[PDB]
């Protein structure tokens, strides 16, 4: 999107990419499971925007302690994707007890 003179113009950049990696080693602060927003909507007809990743560390008020860690996400092997490329990923759950859906 190039905003020039009040008139907005949105053109596709075929050579631009996006990086997408999956932390399979759990080396980054796990944020899911805190019941945050930004889920695939429930209704399939609508489009959603992807939430921003941010993490927390130890603190002493608004300050950082010695053990406070800084994780650079650019320090992981991402996978650049142009239009035309796709990202596939598989995962198999460990053995967890059935959820008792009965009274």
């Amino acid at each position: 999107v190039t905003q020039n003179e009040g008139t907005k113009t949105i053109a596709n950049n075929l050579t631009s990419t996006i990086q997408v990696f999956t932390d399979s080693e759990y080396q980054l602060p796990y944020v899911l499971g805190s019941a945050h927003q930004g889920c695939l909507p429930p209704f399939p007809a609508d489009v959603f925007m992807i939430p921003q990743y941010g993490y927390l560390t130890l603190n002493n008020g608004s300050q950082a302690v010695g053990r406070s860690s800084f994780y650079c996400l650019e320090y992981f092997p991402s996978q650049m994707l142009r239009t035309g490329n796709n990202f596939q990923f598989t995962y198999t759950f460990e053995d967890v007890p059935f959820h008792s859906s009965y009274a």
Binding site: E25, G66, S69
Partner: protein, 103 residues
């Protein structure tokens, strides 16, 4: 609760004593147990080899961690060394929790 590894079958107790060596008994039979013994004690060496399994740190953190270090400042005597009289002393209690990891 004092720390360590709880074991159901811990290293057994190695018990050791000096076998009694009676002093010269009477020349006439006395049913009473001999209470006179040759004074002795034993010495010798003992080795104990233990193999420990480690779990190497794979931190993908960006900034430096907190290592245990001997403070660089000059002292009268080195820490964890013998003093001028040959008396070895451990100046402080060292724990293990230095490296950090996410929760």
């Amino acid at each position: 609760l004092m720390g360590g590894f709880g074991l159901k079958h811990p290293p057994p107790q190695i018990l050791i004593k000096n076998t009694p060596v009676p002093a010269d008994p009477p020349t006439t039979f006395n049913q009473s147990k001999l209470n006179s013994f040759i004074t002795q004690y034993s010495t010798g060496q003992v080795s104990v080899e233990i193999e420990w399994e480690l779990q190497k740190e794979n931190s993908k953190r960006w900034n430096p961690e907190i290592q245990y270090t001997s403070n660089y400042y000059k002292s009268t005597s080195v820490d964890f060394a013998v003093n001028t009289e040959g008396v070895y002393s451990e100046p402080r209690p060292i724990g293990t929790r230095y490296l950090t990891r996410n929760l």
